[PDB]
Amino acid sequence: PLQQTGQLFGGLVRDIRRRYPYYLSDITDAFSPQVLAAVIFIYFAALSPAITFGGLLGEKTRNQMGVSELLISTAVQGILFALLGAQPLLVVGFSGPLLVFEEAFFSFCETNGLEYIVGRVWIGFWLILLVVLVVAFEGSFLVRFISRYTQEIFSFLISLIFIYETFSKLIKIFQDHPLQKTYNYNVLMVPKPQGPLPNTALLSLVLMAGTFFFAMMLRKFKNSSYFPGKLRRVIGDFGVPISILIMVLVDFFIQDTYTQKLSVPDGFKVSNSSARGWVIHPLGLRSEFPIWMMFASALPALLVFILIFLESQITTLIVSKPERKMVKGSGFHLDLLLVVGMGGVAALFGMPWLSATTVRSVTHANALTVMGKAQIQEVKEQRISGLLVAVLVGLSILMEPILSRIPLAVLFGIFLYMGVTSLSGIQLFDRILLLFKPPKYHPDVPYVKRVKTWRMHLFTGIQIICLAVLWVVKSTPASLALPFVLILTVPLRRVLLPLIFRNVELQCLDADDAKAT
Amino acid sequence: PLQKTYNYNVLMVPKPQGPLPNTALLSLVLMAGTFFFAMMLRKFKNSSYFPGKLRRVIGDFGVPISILIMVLVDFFIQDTYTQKLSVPDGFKVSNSSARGWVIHPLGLRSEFPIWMMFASALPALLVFILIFLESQITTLIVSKPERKMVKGSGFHLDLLLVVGMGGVAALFGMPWLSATTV
Amino acid sequence: RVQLAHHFSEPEITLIIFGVMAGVIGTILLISYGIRRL
Numbered sequence A: 001p002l003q004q005t006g007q008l009f010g011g012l013v014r015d016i017r018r019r020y021p022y023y024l025s026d027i028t029d030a031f032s033p034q035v036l037a038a039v040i041f042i043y044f045a046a047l048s049p050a051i052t053f054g055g056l057l058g059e060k061t062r063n064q065m066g067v068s069e070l071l072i073s074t075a076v077q078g079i080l081f082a083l084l085g086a087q088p089l090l091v092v093g094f095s096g097p098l099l100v101f102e103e104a105f106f107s108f109c110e111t112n113g114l115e116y117i118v119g120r121v122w123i124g125f126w127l128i129l130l131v132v133l134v135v136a137f138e139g140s141f142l143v144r145f146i147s148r149y150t151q152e153i154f155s156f157l158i159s160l161i162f163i164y165e166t167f168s169k170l171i172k173i174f175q176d177h178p179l180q181k182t183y184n185y186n187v188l189m190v191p192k193p194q195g196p197l198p199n200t201a202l203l204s205l206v207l208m209a210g211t212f213f214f215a216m217m218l219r220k221f222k223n224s225s226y227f228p229g230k231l232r233r234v235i236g237d238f239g240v241p242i243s244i245l246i247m248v249l250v251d252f253f254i255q256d257t258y259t260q261k262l263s264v265p266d267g268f269k270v271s272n273s274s275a276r277g278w279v280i281h282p283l284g285l286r287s288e289f290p291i292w293m294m295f296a297s298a299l300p301a302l303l304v305f306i307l308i309f310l311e312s313q314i315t316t317l318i319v320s321k322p323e324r325k326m327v328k329g330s331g332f333h334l335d336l337l338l339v340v341g342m343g344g345v346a347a348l349f350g351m352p353w354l355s356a357t358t359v360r361s362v363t364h365a366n367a368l369t370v371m372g373k374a375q376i377q378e379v380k381e382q383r384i385s386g387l388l389v390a391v392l393v394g395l396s397i398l399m400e401p402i403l404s405r406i407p408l409a410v411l412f413g414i415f416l417y418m419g420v421t422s423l424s425g426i427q428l429f430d431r432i433l434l435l436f437k438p439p440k441y442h443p444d445v446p447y448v449k450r451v452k453t454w455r456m457h458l459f460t461g462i463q464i465i466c467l468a469v470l471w472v473v474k475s476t477p478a479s480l481a482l483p484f485v486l487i488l489t490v491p492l493r494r495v496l497l498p499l500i501f502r503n504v505e506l507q508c509l510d511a512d513d514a515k516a517t
Numbered sequence B: 001p002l003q004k005t006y007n008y009n010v011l012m013v014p015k016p017q018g019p020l021p022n023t024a025l026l027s028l029v030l031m032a033g034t035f036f037f038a039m040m041l042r043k044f045k046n047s048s049y050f051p052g053k054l055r056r057v058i059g060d061f062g063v064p065i066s067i068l069i070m071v072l073v074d075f076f077i078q079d080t081y082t083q084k085l086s087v088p089d090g091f092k093v094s095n096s097s098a099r100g101w102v103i104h105p106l107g108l109r110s111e112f113p114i115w116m117m118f119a120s121a122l123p124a125l126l127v128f129i130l131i132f133l134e135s136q137i138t139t140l141i142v143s144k145p146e147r148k149m150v151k152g153s154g155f156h157l158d159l160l161l162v163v164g165m166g167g168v169a170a171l172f173g174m175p176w177l178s179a180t181t182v
Numbered sequence C: 001r002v003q004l005a006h007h008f009s010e011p012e013i014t015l016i017i018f019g020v021m022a023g024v025i026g027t028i029l030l031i032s033y034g035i036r037r038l
Helices: A010-023 A033-060 A067-084 A096-109 A116-136 A139-145 A148-176 A200-223 A229-237 A239-252 A291-296 A298-319 A332-348 A358-367 A384-394 A408-421 A427-436 A453-474 A479-487 A489-499 A503-509 B023-046 B052-060 B062-075 B115-119 B121-142 B157-171 C010-034
Strands: A369-371 A376-379
Touching: A010 A116, A010 A332, A033 A067, A033 A096, A033 A229, A033 A239, A033 A358, A033 A384, A033 A408, A067 A332, A067 A384, A096 A116, A096 A298, A096 A479, A116 A139, A116 A291, A116 A298, A116 A332, A116 C010, A139 A298, A139 A332, A148 A200, A148 A298, A148 A358, A148 A408, A148 A427, A148 A453, A148 A479, A148 A489, A200 A229, A200 A239, A200 A408, A200 B023, A229 A239, A239 A408, A291 A298, A298 A332, A298 A358, A298 A479, A358 A369, A358 A384, A358 A408, A427 A453, A453 A479, A453 A489, A453 A503, A479 A489, A489 A503, B023 B052, B023 B062, B052 B062, B115 B121, B121 B157
Parallel strands: none
Antiparallel strands: A369 A376
């Protein structure tokens, strides 16, 4: 899939010829309750980060880009990616690094007295130029140099970040309503409580813990030997929706205590009707856009392209490993082209650029994964799931009465479940577990029975240092250099690691398909 | 109960006379966390992690470790009230106006009638039946051959000791005791 | 609200920008076709 043909748009044409023959199966294979359960899962799993990130941006940018734009953009790009993408299981949505960027822009546009929404119309314009050249010249063939080392490091780091953010939100909830001896019983509630409230933090903790417990118990019940197998697997597939419904009912029947609910905009309108419309003029809204910034937008366009490219390609590598029983094919060139082109086009209408998020796509793939008689058997690879997720995300505004009664703590438990379940397939996480195990309990795997124990532990520890370095960079104002430091692991694997490990050891430890050389 | 408003001026001695915020939820959290830690340490005993000696030592102390962890968690929350253990001040009778340490079989305040001295056999029969069934079924359960008991158990000596000590402690106005199952 | 007046409207200016971009892409493709042959 990553071979270079030498023809202009050679990779793009091969991606179309590989997946589009399976378009008929990509609709008929979704006729199963597991697909519906995965839709219900990924709907919340993509809606809640969308609501959070848009609301954050509405604060860091006088509501220039807000929940309405990040929801409409997510819906449109998800629909177009599900209908035309080569790997439909990817969930395209806003991310943290993209917020760190769209924040620097306002710290750059506000400093220079420039228009923030009009500068992007120009970044998105420069984004289309870059991706077309990369796709035509088969620039996606460089992904074949991203081995299991970088993929697993990135996945482990991103999962740790997700879990840390999920716990930090609960910490923030506890801080906002601390356990006090006395409270002011008359506190203004609109738009948010202006003071600490009783029982709020403890109820949020109870809801999150119960949601996580029920999700894990139903997941274990899926593989258990109780009930008829058909009903057992049907209930296990709907474990997350059942847990969400149970905890929603539990919070609903507790009337007195206040818990924060999902908040969606009133209607399909821009966030700041006093700033911009639906179509933003590339030459400026209030003041004439300078000519120099039109050519100066290439460097932010380069940074956005690097971020989106690394995220989408590493996510596609993770979700399309041959060990995951993906027997339909994945297209690196077509997905990158679609994502970057849709971002550049949506930049015109003021809607944010989106990328293939790792945790959401891995959860979407796992929610469609069918386990046979412990062993992965097949994956429900179809376009209907992502299309329905995008449609429900777009319709989230119109279904406010349903969303307004759903607590965030339930979604916090769901996020914790997603974080703990995203670490199953990572061999780095497996070798981290072996650091606390005696060598006689190590599994019958190529990297144990052919490599010395201390050599494997040293190889794992080298990866842990990279994880710490990437974590430090994230916790710094220069967090946009994370893709470069992540890329720097590839020279570490291909150059410095052979200087201390033999070829057989690196083949066993870094295997593209978990083979014994 | 979970309420929108609470009375912040609630008397605390001897027990709180009104509902208090964050109490029931914190109790639920403490109970769930204690159970979770106990079960996880029980799993960790049979787990393949850590050296076997240290792992088994930690697993044996799993219940005390969970108790200590949750006690410290509650201790580091000063503002919220949670019900604690309550033991008496000293080794004294509960009511010094009613009885002493040794109770006269003929009566304390009023003369005890003769007829109840013979009529007490039937309640004594009921107490003997209760204690006998409890202790003997508990001994049968704890001494099954599948539990790898290789030292033997006594159904006659233990019953004799339990019922005799209960009868002796009854003379001092202390409760009779049986071999509880759990 | 009130926006600054421009000689080109939004569809006109975006068509001009996309045409310039397509011309640049075509020029780059023709140059790359010229190389790797002579």
